[PDB]
Ligand binder design. Structure first.
Ligand SMILES: c1ccc2c(c1)[nH]c1ccccc12
Ligand SMILES: c1ccc2c(c1)[nH]c1ccccc12
Ligand code: FES
Ligand code: FES
Ligand code: FES
Ligand SMILES: [Fe+2]
Ligand SMILES: [Fe+2]
Ligand SMILES: [Fe+2]
Ligand SMILES: [Mg+2]
Lengths: 383, 383, 383
């Protein structure tokens, strides 16, 4: 639907993924932190190409599409919350209920036959772990758990994150995240030197293609993901050679991190443990539009008591945010931006030359293709 | 010729209007004020996508296409007017007569077979009420009166105004103007308060459409327009209610204004009286290109003699320009801008949801669709 | 490929040239001066739409396509030359030899089946007269002499130059260069007044259109060019008239310049003598993309020894560069830019109205159509 049928015929084994330029409809996506939206202070954002309004009313989050039914203006151009449970379009004062999006009044024609006969599109919103998730899909939402990686919703898991807008397609971000050989870009990271990480340049893989990955379609809560197992067998590269001569050493720290790396629909990476043995990184690559994504980064630590919470909160601010989320992952931002041009025309998908460590990326593309809950299209954005 | 055949098939009530992206060929359009162009000071501008040169020679206005027949450069890059009667292209000195566009000389080859055998496109131009009108069309022009609203050209009607370029398609501007319910956006305007206006939130209608408006397809001089008389049987709304409660009130001033509103081909609005009970607003939405229009605003006031004229002039400058043409209509500018996205892919014309107040807009779309003197196309602009 | 057939069928005799938006494959092109690329300091540039990486290894230049075979990133985002003969992609460490582009290693997986089974595109590179030439084409190169004007490579010819990126298609630069009547734009030039150059406004052509130019396809090194001979039989315009009235004079002067003007594939102008009787000007218009070219300007002065070269360089820096290459040719830059709009949509090639001196430009469009060694396409750029 989104990509020239020419290209899609050439990528048979994962064509729906190559079509999914605007992301996957009928999933939950994190868009902002709970503390970023206050009572009666609506925030505007774009998710899967759609402009959305989010309001906190009596502490509960509500989501309306930020496009008036009348002349298609963004309500957020000038917000007019005239009662507590409504928003009034600034233009001809069509008035919508936050609760169901029902056109309930029109201040400029209070007898209009449209009143009570039209519905502004709403999306479910749920807050979990201090994160705002929107279900960008139609009808009754599934449980959040289905669209989160394992352990993110554990009772004791304390989540602290950072969010920013990155100018790459969401898929270049996923494949950067789930890439076993990409750790090459991280070899001079301050995190690797200061936190004395064990980090190879890469992996010479071992065993057959089936041993590289473990596809999880078997999860009780209905998660879809792929674990990378390139190491479980593979020989780590700590001495990078050219013509036999050794030109670069990996890092020989004592701290073992990234034992397990997994990627889950709709596009959330879990790296455990990282950046410390006492932690997990969960990061989403949320589609804003075809060119843009939220890099929604979270660090999880199990905490038992509020003193452990507050110690973690301090360590996040002083150590992990600036050293890991910025000073490790910043290289991941540059990497994603560098792939934009080769995939810009949708032709990257056919002219790329993959090697063995991309077996992981291939399984994710197949997983993504068969188990996605729908392909967002310009039809969803416009019509 | 300008819009996907898919879309035109879905707006059969008024398809030619949806096609008129660049506006209507073979009408008069205001482009600037008489005072803004001095003797032998050529000015360049763009009208219906066409770059044009205007010059005043012995007090009279002449208009050439600003595109040399030879290599297609704008002459306005470096104007060479070497005789009153000619302009010389800066590139290879092809010399055109302002009066008829004839290639009369070539300084770089006075023996050229092209001399006397080529003609640069010219457009009729004339000044009325201190406004420069160009006839952007072919053949002999109609009287200017055909393309001007009633009373604009009256012996005693003093015209004063302001012009600015706005980044919206001209039709968005037309429809904001001729919108009885849009009035809502003006409800906190400094003019409404300080000129004590009786501005309701929304002129709501009353009855069956076929008298929501009067179609003038019958005017002596060939004028084509739509009067909105939504009320006269309908109603003004001063009490804006959500779920039965007054959330907002209109303006409680003495002065009855906007009593009658009319829109005229090729796209000019008359508001009588406005912004005071003794004057009228005439405003044009002149297509520059698909994305841009001149907002050509004028205020009309009957004046007996130059004493009444000079008095209207100081009132205009001290009061009506800042409070009305800026203070009031500045709202109308960012409103048009807010409609750009929904209509940018010509999809807004299929996806819009109208209510009763828009009956007058629909009449305009039909009137415009039936009585325009041609669709400007990219063929007319280039080839 | 590049242009619609509705256009190409209407330019029979030079359709390939109208098609060559990105210029001609299988020719040498200057891109920079030798002094600009130092030992082991690689530089990026775009040529004929393609991103290229040039490096100096043991004094010799090599050129690799600046696009990894793997995920198609530019290597130059972060240059890693680990050994003298290789460059390592910063992402997954695919390692290429400069000499033949062979994938000789991958640091992230030294057992990859890809090693020794993939080639990164190379292009020959050659330095002459302090200028860097890349053979942007396939197979083995002809000698450089084929793609240089006569006398450029002469033993005693001292070359001093200047390079800058100009926002026009390369063909508008060439045509402006070789346009006999474009000298009209230089009538007010400081160089013409202060160096007392004889400069007419243009030429009334002398008789037969087939003696306005000499085509050269029978040269010792396979050079392909046209000479403008309009000055041979032409009558110079020194008194430009409008209606018989002298409105502009040419520049009287003792210095006869531009006795011979010739344009050579792939798009290099030679003007002899210029800007002084003891010097020549060679300028290339090198395609960067559809919209952009290198204006690669050089001045040749036969120098018999080293006081002569130093003396020449003094003159260049103090007078010729600012007065001639800058002062005089800045009007050529503005002239190119002024034609961009008419030719942008490819309609200019059909809509232009040519006159007698354009015989030179038509002869060049035929020469280029006949003797170019390949049309560069998006296929060569993307895949
Ligand atoms: C291998 C090893 C570590 C990581 C990875 C792949 N992908 C990542 C994304 C965020 C943080 C760490 C990692
Ligand atoms: C109703 C009432 C006043 C106005 C209107 C619609 N449209 C307008 C455009 C310009 C100035 C005033 C008005
Ligand atoms: S655009 Fe929202 S009410 Fe008209
Ligand atoms: S472009 Fe105007 S005379 Fe040549
Ligand atoms: S993109 Fe160059 S090695 Fe992967
Ligand atoms: Fe990374
Ligand atoms: Fe208005
Ligand atoms: Fe020139
Ligand atoms: Mg002189």
């Amino acid at each position: 639907a989104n990509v020239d049928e020419a290209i899609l015929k050439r990528v048979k084994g994962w064509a729906p993924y190559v079509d999914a330029k605007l992301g996957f409809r009928n999933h939950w996506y994190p868009v902002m932190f709970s503390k970023e939206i206050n009572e009666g202070e609506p925030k505007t954002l774009k998710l899967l190409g759609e402009n959305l309004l989010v309001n906190r009313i009596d502490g509960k989050l509500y989501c309306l599409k930020d496009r008036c039914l009348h002349r298609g203006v963004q309500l957020s151009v000038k917000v007019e919350c005239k009662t507590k449970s409504t928003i009034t379009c600034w233009y001809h004062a069509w008035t919508y209920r936050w609760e169901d999006g029902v056109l309930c009044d029109i201040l400029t024609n209070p007898t209009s036959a449209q009143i009570g006969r039209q519905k502004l599109k709403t999306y479910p919103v749920q807050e979990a772990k201090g994160c705002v998730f929107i279900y960008l899909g139609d009808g009754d939402p599934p449980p959040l758990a289905r669209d989160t990686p394992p352990n993110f919703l554990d009772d004791d898991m304390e989540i602290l994150g950072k969010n920013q807008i990155i100018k790459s397609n969401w898929r270049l971000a996923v494949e950067n995240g789930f890439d076993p050989s990409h750790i090459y870009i991280h070899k001079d990271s301050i995190l690797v030197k200061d936190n004395d990480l064990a980090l190879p340049l890469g992996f010479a893989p071992g065993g057959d293609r089936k041993q590289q990955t473990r596809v999880v379609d078997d999860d009780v809560v209905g998660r879809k993901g792929v674990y990378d197992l390139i190491g479980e067998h593979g020989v780590p590269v700590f001495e990078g050679t050219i013509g036999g001569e050794v030109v670069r050493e990996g890092a020989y720290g004592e701290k073992i991190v990234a034992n397990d790396i997994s990627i889950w629909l709709p596009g959330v990476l879990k790296v455990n443990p990282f950046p410390n043995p006492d932690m997990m990184q969960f990061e989403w690559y949320v589609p804003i539009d075809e060119n843009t994504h939220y890099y929604f980064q979270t660090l999880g630590k199990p905490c038992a008591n509020d003193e452990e919470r507050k110690k973690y909160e301090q360590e996040f601010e002083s150590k992990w945010k600036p050293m890991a989320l910025e000073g490790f992952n910043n290289d991941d931002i540059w990497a994603r931006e560098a792939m934009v041009d080769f995939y810009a025309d949708d032709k990257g998908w056919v002219n790329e030359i993959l090697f063995e460590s991309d077996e992981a990326i291939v399984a994710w593309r197949k997983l993504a293709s068969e188990h996605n809950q729908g392909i967002q299209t310009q039809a969803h954005v416009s019509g």
